[PDB]
Amino acid sequence: FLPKGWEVRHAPNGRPFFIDHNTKTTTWEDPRLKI
């Protein structure tokens, strides 16, 4: 469950980083917390 447009990709960081393709942006914190 994540903001419309954002992709969840699991990196070797043991971390899923959030990535929006329509605005070209990446986040470690869920973009719902930072809009």
Binding site: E7, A11, N13, F17, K24, T25
Partner: peptide
């Protein structure tokens, strides 16, 4: 840590 530069099309 370490943010990735974004460009995914």
């Amino acid at each position: 840590t370490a943010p990735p530069e974004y460009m995914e099309a």
